[PDB]
Amino acid sequence: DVNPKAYPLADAHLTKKLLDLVQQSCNYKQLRKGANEATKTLNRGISEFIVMAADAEPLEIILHLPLLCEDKNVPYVFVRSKQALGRACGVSRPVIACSVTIKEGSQLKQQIQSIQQSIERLLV
Amino acid sequence: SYMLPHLHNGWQVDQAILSEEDRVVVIRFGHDWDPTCMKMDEVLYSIAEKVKNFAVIYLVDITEVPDFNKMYELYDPCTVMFFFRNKHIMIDLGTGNNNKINWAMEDKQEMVDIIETVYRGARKGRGLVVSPKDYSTKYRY
Amino acid sequence: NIANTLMAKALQECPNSGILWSEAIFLEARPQRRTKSVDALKKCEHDPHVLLAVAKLFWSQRKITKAREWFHRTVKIDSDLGDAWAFFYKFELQHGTEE
């Protein structure tokens, strides 16, 4: 909508599920907020999927994240507002990028796998 | 010295004594150009804000107000008088004179000490309070 | 870049793989941030020449004592493959003292 350079941009149906997963990972200490921490997780190879926002006006500050995901074969998806993503991540400040890491025997494995599957069929 | 409020005529100082009930009126009688009076009119500067709750400081030039020289013995170069609810609070120092501090001191804590002691003894309803320090000497050695 | 993507995909598939984890830090990872990759590989408890990869990383960092200690650890039963013994022999022959 606002930004044509939005490839995996998701609609207002699975965005609710994405934010629910973000909150649950927050309760489980299972996310890294911020573009820099998402990039570090991608570099370490422990990132499972990262969600960013299409409201950051210089989107190219976070447009290296989909390229890094393509390099590491990591699902990636956008949202429609940075404020909602930030508030869902567990912080008041607007966040434009968050990552979800791994956990041994995680109770969120089924939902994170479902989210990975849902995003991967939305690229086209 | 020059920063503290000044009183110009006889009526003003009597009003300043009368226009207050819940603090102590500390009046520095003397001449603000005196080396002695200027020594302690800066101590009274450095503590004017600190003792705002229970003390107000007015300055009086005896030449400008020649109405209290005879009655209160204003002939030492510098004099400090404490008043509470229109009542001169006598204070017992180490010196013989027990109605005034006729010398300019140097430490900003001792003057607040004396003012707070005067306030404490005046809330009770005394007329003569006793200073903590003894001024029968100068502790020099 | 294609090799880096293939290495990332291989790491994503059964990361516990000793050979892939050992050959990732030394080959794909640059000397800068190689230590982080070395720690990530060491996060896997098993050391089938992974300790040898740590020894190679230490030798690249020119740490003689650390390289010798890792090679002694690598030459043990943890990484008892002959590659560790050959690397230890080469390093001892290439040591500054060579005594």
Place this chain on the structure above:
Amino acid sequence: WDRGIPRINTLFQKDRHTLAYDKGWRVRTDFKQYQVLKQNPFWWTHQRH
């Protein structure tokens, strides 16, 4: 009793063992002036040793 510069009564002192591991005590007693504000008149010795 009460004779000898290292007073004989020190031999019977309770902490005699641990004072055996206290070496250079007089030097640090001398330098105590730089760590504590008030000067020690008995800087030259130490009542324990």
Place this chain on the structure above:
Amino acid sequence: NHTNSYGIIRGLQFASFIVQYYGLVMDLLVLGLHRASEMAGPPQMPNDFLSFQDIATEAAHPIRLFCRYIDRIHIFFRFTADEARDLIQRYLTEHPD
């Protein structure tokens, strides 16, 4: 504030040791490695305070006694007439009187 970058801190707990050791730095420059290795004696049998195993060692150098307090340094020489005259001449050569 100021960042101490040139002076030892005497308020430090171990400072004494440093000073003592650093005193061991300077006093040998006064003694020289030879005389220092005669007051201290052989490491096998170190001497006590102000004592030499042989009389010849005392008679082998000007500096016969030495004692070092925290800052104070206390030397006691013993010059024969000839060496005293030699030292006086050496001083006066670099200092006309």
Place this chain on the structure above:
Amino acid sequence: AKLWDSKMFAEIMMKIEEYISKQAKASEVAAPEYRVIVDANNLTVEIENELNIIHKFIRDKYSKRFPELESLVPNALDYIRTVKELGNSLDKCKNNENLQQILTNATIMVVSVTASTTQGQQLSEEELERLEEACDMALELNASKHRIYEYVESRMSFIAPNLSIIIGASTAAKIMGVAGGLTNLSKMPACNIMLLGAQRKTLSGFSSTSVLPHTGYIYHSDIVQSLPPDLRRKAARLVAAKCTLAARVDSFHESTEGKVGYELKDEIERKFDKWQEPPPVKQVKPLPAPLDGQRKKRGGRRYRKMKERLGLTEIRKQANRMSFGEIEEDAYQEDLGFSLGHLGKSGSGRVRQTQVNEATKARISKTLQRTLQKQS
């Protein structure tokens, strides 16, 4: 030997880059201009990847003469220059002018002191046809690195307009060349971009704070050094963050006129002059008035514990009593006038020793115990 032959291809590539850059001085007076920057960056990365191995070879070959100098001189080029200058005989360290141009006076004196106590032995003539050749090619590679440094600095007015204005093209080149290219550092977090070219300087018997620890090219940039030493770290973090914000823009070549770069510079300057703003007006509250007769107070478990902490313990109350007409030997030689009174006195008191209380035991604060937990 093997390293010198390896640099031959790199030497030819550097000669080609020199021909291109000399032509760049004429062509700028189908092989575009940007590629002449990209391939040059690749070539400087390669010459660094050869400088490291030749420095390793120099350290390995020279450890026979002096095995401690590498632990005292961390920087590579400094190590090559020092081993080139000292030579086999180390008596060339006293009042040596060219040592000063490479090493700090403190580290000059530490390496000289180590040179006094060396267990290394002299090198043969064969070692002097290897180490000096390696040092010469190291200086040649450094000259090539600087000769492409100037060209990259000149051309970052075009290749990275946004990043070249926040920090300046010089430090911009120093941080983009070492990072492996603009694309490489675009994938790099600002925290890592801070440590670009962060030398692990060997502390010369100093506090680690004195020799800047964890300090990178961004901390040595002109913008941060303009600030007082206390704010520099806080300024370094912010300037590196905005540097990577501009770097991600410049990687994909947006805002080539520098609008985002100017916006980031404006934000940096606003934060800077907000930090340097003088403190505001703070009112001097007066001392509280002397208290009145009585005031009602609460009481419970908290008041009970306050009364327990400040209550007269039996050992304390027994010490206050000081007998009468009973001389006692002056305890605590270092300060007399400290008598325990009836505590441990045969005059009066309990037959059993006064047992020590537990409520008066010394206790640490909550925040201080928190510091203990974090420190461990």
Place this chain on the structure above:
Amino acid sequence: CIKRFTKNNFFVEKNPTIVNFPITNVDLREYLSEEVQAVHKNTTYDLIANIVHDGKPSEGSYRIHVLHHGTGKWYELQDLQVTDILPQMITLSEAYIQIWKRR
């Protein structure tokens, strides 16, 4: 001459302000009226001797930078000191008395 040592209202101090001054090229033509500037065809001066003072007024030790004419060796003499300094240590130190030559 350079006014380093000056008395305050209470105690005499020194003004330790370093000066950056050349030694072989200076122009002074702006300091003369033109009705006099025409007379002089040489307003350029070269330093010859320099005076540098040490420490407090009550504890001082003068040092001298002399230029050996013909050559360019600047030599530092305190009491018997002899040292051919470079033309930069003359600028770094704080001067007190300078000697020139109009040539």
Place this chain on the structure above:
Amino acid sequence: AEVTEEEWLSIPEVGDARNKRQRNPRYEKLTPVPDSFFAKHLQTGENHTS
């Protein structure tokens, strides 16, 4: 004399630099020494017999 009339109006009001926790400290409680000192002092003053 050559200071503009507005520049005297543009004089900034200086303020204190120190924070609240150093300008206006909460009153520092002055507690007694732990009584373990009274016991230790007498404990050090007892000797053995052999």
Place this chain on the structure above:
Amino acid sequence: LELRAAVMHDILDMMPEGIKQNKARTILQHLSEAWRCWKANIPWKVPGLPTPIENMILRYVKAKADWWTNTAHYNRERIRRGATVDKTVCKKNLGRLTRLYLKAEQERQHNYLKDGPYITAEEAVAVYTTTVHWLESRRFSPIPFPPLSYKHDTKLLILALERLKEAYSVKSRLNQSQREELGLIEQAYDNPHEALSRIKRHLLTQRAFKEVGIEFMDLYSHLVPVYDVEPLEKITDAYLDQY
């Protein structure tokens, strides 16, 4: 008082007679702030201040600082010579001398930083080779690091804690920092193993330390510096000293 009064009189005199004369207290506060900054040896540069006002305030500060230095030295001379002086006079004079000595120390440290070491490499090598020859002649083995398993490990810790507590052995009332210090020693006595592990870690990997406070005790002849060290680091320093 006379100098400050003259400065304020001139400034208010040439200050325009408008409503702006409400800014007299502002000028006095500026004067006090500049004097404090010179006393605190802290940079003082008001951005919006006019250059004539700034010049006059600098001259005021310089004059009062000259008088301050002279008066402090004269009072010190009075005290050392044995003259009769007051207690508050001694306190103020000690404060002034502390400020002056710390300014001189800032000068000396900054001079060392820019001038590098004052010891030449030649003399340093001579001293070092003398020391190493001495130590080799004495057959002195180097002091080993305090091992994890040391037989006398707690004995040295006990002695260090007792020494640190000797400063409070004679005491009736304790400040907050003192209470926290006693808490630290008694906790380290309660858990010697963890405290000694902390000490070993500090000795092995700690090189950045918190600022140590300074003051001066006046003997009326010279001033002895008194250094206050961080309470936790005092324990480590004492154990190291004992070992």
Place this chain on the structure above:
Amino acid sequence: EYLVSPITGEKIPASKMQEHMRIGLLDPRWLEQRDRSIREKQSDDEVYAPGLDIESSLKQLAERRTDIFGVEETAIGKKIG
């Protein structure tokens, strides 16, 4: 764009929800300390003189201390000589 207020459950503009959460949870007792100290300083009476009074007192002091002010020196208490 409309969101739902977490505290009131009412449609809110998406642009304001940040400061909406900042301010809708404004702590009620904060209002008195905002409206209490300001009243204290409003009713507070000054301690030092008005600036014109400092100016006048400075003139009067300069009238006497000719050892500092003026050009015609006289006694400490004398007006002029």
Place this chain on the structure above:
Amino acid sequence: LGVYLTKKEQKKLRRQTRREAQKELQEKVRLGLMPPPEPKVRISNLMRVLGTEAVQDPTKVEAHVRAQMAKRQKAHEEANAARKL
């Protein structure tokens, strides 16, 4: 759709609700619509609160404090029962 406020404002809002309830209760009691809260007492507080009055008739006093305990526990249990699904 709604947004999920963070744990900091969770704690802040909970504190607002509890302080609001406490102040409303205190204002109502100051009005007097309910009696002033009788001090909650347990077995450990039995002789701290009522001991002087508990010496004369100890069993009556312990019966009263146990009745207060039972009333509190019953309020809790039937509050859960009312909140039971």
Place this chain on the structure above:
RNA sequence: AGCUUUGCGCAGUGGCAGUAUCGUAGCCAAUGAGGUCUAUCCGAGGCGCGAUUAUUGCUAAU
């Protein structure tokens, strides 16, 4: 049908600390707060100010 995980609420029981709690229509802050170890690493709040019996109420004596 239970079992079970996590967050948020309501209460209950019990322990522990009162050198600490609290406010932020003040400012900045994951577009990075803050960095002593270990820094191509770490990575959430920090600052300034105000309230204070070092959170705040009643009841109770004097």
